[PDB]
Enzyme design. Structure first.
Site, short mmCIF file in Angstrom:
data_model
loop_
_atom_site.label_atom_id
_atom_site.label_comp_id
_atom_site.label_asym_id
_atom_site.label_seq_id
_atom_site.Cartn_x
_atom_site.Cartn_y
_atom_site.Cartn_z
N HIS A 41 0.93 -1.12 0.08
CA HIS A 41 0.17 -0.02 -0.26
C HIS A 41 0.82 1.22 0.53
O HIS A 41 0.51 2.36 0.12
CB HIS A 41 -1.00 0.18 1.16
CG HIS A 41 -0.63 0.33 2.91
ND1 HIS A 41 0.33 -0.62 3.22
CD2 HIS A 41 -0.22 1.41 2.78
CE1 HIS A 41 0.78 -0.09 4.48
NE2 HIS A 41 0.72 1.50 4.82
N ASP A 88 -1.05 -7.11 1.71
CA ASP A 88 0.38 -5.48 1.93
C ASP A 88 1.29 -5.99 2.05
O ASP A 88 2.06 -6.28 2.92
CB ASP A 88 -0.27 -5.66 2.68
CG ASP A 88 -0.24 -3.62 3.14
OD1 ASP A 88 0.00 -3.29 1.50
OD2 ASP A 88 0.23 -3.08 3.84
N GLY A 178 3.63 6.45 8.82
CA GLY A 178 5.11 6.50 8.58
C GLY A 178 5.71 5.29 8.53
O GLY A 178 6.82 5.46 8.04
N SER A 180 4.74 2.33 8.07
CA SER A 180 4.10 1.24 7.01
C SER A 180 5.98 0.26 6.17
O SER A 180 6.24 1.59 5.60
CB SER A 180 3.22 1.99 6.06
OG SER A 180 2.12 2.46 7.12
#
Ligand SMILES: [Ca+2]
Length: 228
Positions: A41, A88, A178, A180
């Site tokens: 993502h 993800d 911030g 991820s």
């Protein structure tokens, strides 16, 4: 990263960051000499992989800007519905081999699946405060523990797949915005990628949810050695 602290500079040599000029977008994990593993993502038409950084403000010395020549997300991911965060996971091929050594180093892939209670660490330049957000100049780290998949499923009913894993800390340690794409590291091996979590961050009610790297070992090693 809440409930954490500024890491020793370049103590996480696999740490990477995704940039647009001078705006931090996501984290990253150096998996190969020419490969970075981050959250799916975090995809954007335009970003720079930045390796061997500690302080965004100042020169640390082992800074390597590296362009991306391939954005490869998981083929079972879907960036359409905001409620689904399954698969993800994304691998980004670097234009050239990163200059390796002790401050820039590829992290190994865990060859075993995790167990609840297992010691792990997370790192990122994401905000250290929730709900109000101020962001850190220097890289922050924190220790977390991987949750049982059942307790993982109870905090997020019908949101947790087998390709995910929960990590959390009662004591306040949890990634935030911030962070991820950054690493979850257990026993000197990458076991997970920071995906999503608690509102606000650091709640003992809700842990952090990470892509489960021990499940995708075949897909990662396939494109680490057949696309690389
Ligand atoms: Ca720097």
């Amino acid at each position: 990263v809440l409930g954490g602290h500024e890491c020793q500079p370049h103590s996480q040599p696999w740490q990477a960051a995704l940039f647009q000029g001078q705006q931090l977008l996501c984290g990253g994990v150096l998996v190969g000499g020419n490969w970075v593993l981050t959250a799916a993502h975090c995809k954007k038409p335009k970003y720079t992989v930045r390796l061997g950084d500690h302080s965004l403000q100042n020169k640390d010395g082992p800074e390597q800007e590296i362009p991306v020549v391939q954005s490869i997300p998981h083929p079972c991911y879907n960036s359409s519905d905001v409620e689904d965060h399954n698969h993800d996971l994304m691998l980004l091929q670097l234009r050239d081999q990163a200059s390796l050594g002790s401050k820039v180093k590829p992290i190994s892939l865990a060859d075993h699946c995790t167990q609840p209670g297992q010691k792990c660490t997370v790192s990122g330049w994401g905000t250290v405060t929730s709900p109000r957000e101020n962001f850190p100049d220097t890289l922050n780290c924190a220790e977390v523990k991987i949750f049982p998949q059942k307790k993982c499923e109870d905090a997020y009913p019908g949101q947790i797949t087998d390709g995910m894993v929960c990590a959390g800390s009662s004591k306040g340690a949890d990634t935030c915005q911030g962070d991820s794409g950054g690493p979850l590291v257990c026993d000197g091996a990458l076991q997970g990628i920071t995906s999503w979590g608690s509102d606000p961050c650091g709640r003992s009610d809700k842990p952090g949810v990470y892509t489960n790297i021990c499940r995708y070992l075949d897909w990662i090693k396939k494109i680490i050695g057949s696309k690389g």
